[PDB]
Amino acid sequence: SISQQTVWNQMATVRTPLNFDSSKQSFCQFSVDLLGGGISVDKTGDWITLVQNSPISNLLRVAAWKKGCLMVKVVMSGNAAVKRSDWASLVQVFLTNSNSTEHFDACRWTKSEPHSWELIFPIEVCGPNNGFEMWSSEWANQTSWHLSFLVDNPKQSTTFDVLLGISQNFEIAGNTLMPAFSVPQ
Amino acid sequence: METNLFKLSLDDVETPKGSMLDLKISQSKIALPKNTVGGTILRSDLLANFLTEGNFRASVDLQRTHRIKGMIKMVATVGIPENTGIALACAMNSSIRGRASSDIYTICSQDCELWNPACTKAMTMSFNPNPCSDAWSLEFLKRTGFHCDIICVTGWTATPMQDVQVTIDWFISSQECVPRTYCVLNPQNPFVLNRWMGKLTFPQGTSRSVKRMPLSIGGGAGAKSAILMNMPNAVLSMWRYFVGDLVFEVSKMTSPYIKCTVSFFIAFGNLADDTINFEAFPHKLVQFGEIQEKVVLKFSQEEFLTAWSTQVRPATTLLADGCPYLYAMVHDSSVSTIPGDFVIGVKLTIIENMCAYGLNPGISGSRLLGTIPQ
Amino acid sequence: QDVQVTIDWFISSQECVPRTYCVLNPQNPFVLNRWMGKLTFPQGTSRSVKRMP
RNA sequence: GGUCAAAAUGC
RNA sequence: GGUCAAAAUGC
RNA sequence: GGUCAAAAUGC
Lengths: 185, 374, 53
Prior knowledge:
This is part of a larger assembly, with one copy of chain A (185 residues) and two copies of chain B. Chain A is mainly β and 185 residues long. Chain A has one helix spanning 55-62, and strands spanning 9-15, 27-33, 38-40, 48-51, 66-77, 91-96, 107-111, 116-125, 146-152, 159-166, 171-172, 176-177, 181-182. Chain A has one domain (1-185): Jelly Rolls. In chain A, the strands form two sheets. In chain A, strands 1, 4, 5, 8, 10 and 11 form a six-stranded antiparallel sheet that branches. A five-stranded antiparallel sheet of chain A has the order 3-2-9-6-7, with no helix packed on it. Helix content of chain B is 5%, strand content 35%. Chain B has helices at residues 47-51, 59-63, 138-142, 231-234, and strands at 24-32, 40-46, 72-77, 87-93, 95-96, 111-115, 123-127, 147-154, 164-172, 182-183, 191-202, 211-214, 221-223, 226-228, 241-252, 262-267, 283-286, 294-299, 308-309, 325-330, 342-355. Chain B is globular. Chain A: Interacts with the large capsid protein.
């Protein structure tokens, strides 16, 4: 085919509010629309989000019809000044196709590893065209893939990095006509 | 004495067949105000809104028929004399997600065609809106976002006496819809890219008015503080290194009265603009016939030794590109008897007999691409 | 400046063939040659629709 | 239908 | 004579 | 590669 080993590419980098009042609760909440390219956040604070203008990130935002398997990676880089006997943080991860409460969860992981953790898993896009799917289109009351998170003691489990990779069998077709992507500095 | 309703032919699920007349779905009239400047959105809407614009023979057939296994045919028409020229385009993309861009980079990847009415007095494009299969629906066109953008890329050369109107005739065709899908990791051949590679403008006079175009083509188009993007580029950039034969399409967008012989070749960026000696390089000299507006240019894979990088940082100094460039020059002069600037647009239609060694982690943003008035 | 049309007149190599009209038993194809109109369309975007009886 | 044009040039 | 009905269904 | 153009007119 066309292949290279261990070459994944960046999508997400979500950082947690610094201003967080351990009083109006313990958790912080956020979501990543893997097939849409959008980070949705809390009102808990002033969140620092960034989506990376990656070959793929770039591609999934523009390509209107998607069939195949993409590979995801979420990494927790945390607050390392916190002494390991003093860790109080879990982070509940969810995989859904809507941001609706009435929809049900596809997969559900819960990780509580001090200072850092890794999570590698497959997502597959199956749709009504010929097996092709379009981002949350009204056509077959179409959907996406969403990766939502729930952080407990967000002052500890501070940073989140989302990477994905592509499958030899990802096929697109069409152009979702999108505005200009913003490039830092 | 009774009639059976059941054995009546009221349940026919078939694609409309007929004469070009019978299979007429709409008539859009588009307005070309004589003070048009170029980069102007003449009309940007939804296809379904373009097609629902008149009650013409298969019009209800468009609306009350669930599966149409035929193709949307456009026939455009506006005549402009030979001492002026406008450069219009019809860009059909598959969805719009927000306040989107209407450049030409961003709107020419799927199915779009540029035409100078002074030279081409009647264009006909045909497309298949479900690049994934063989049938479409109006409700599809409706609830999915099929877009049609009609833009001016290089404004009037001579300003006409009063306003103008382009009338587009819309129809359903006699020919089947054929998919065009993209495997991103196992490209096809010939790979369809369709990339605005630039709007080359050559002022009137004896200036070699040398235009260099990067052959690195991932990220896409540059914007002030942003990157512009179209799938056929999105994917290319998924790879790391590339080769193949690059097939370019040079279009005249100025008035058949503005003359120039343009010289195209392939080199590197280290050369000075006063390099007497280039034309001792494989080169091809282009000249346009009065009413001729399209020259197709093919550079063979034998004009490149080794595959090149798909991305190069935006600052990389014309002295540090190790990647091949596409140089355009004036071999004579730009001459006219009316104010005007010679403008020709270049679009990389297909990379044929491609080789992609790699996978690109990415490089932030990309560089700029030419544009300007008229 | 002014212009001049020069018409060259000659006798031809080809025979003369009649064209008579029976008024009550027309021929085919019937030759009529009728100025049906001088249609003038002003510059602009006017359907400037011309109907001829 | 007539007319006309056309079925092309050089030694 | 026209019209109409009829010479029948399922995968 | 698609599109397009083209393989031409008259009774």
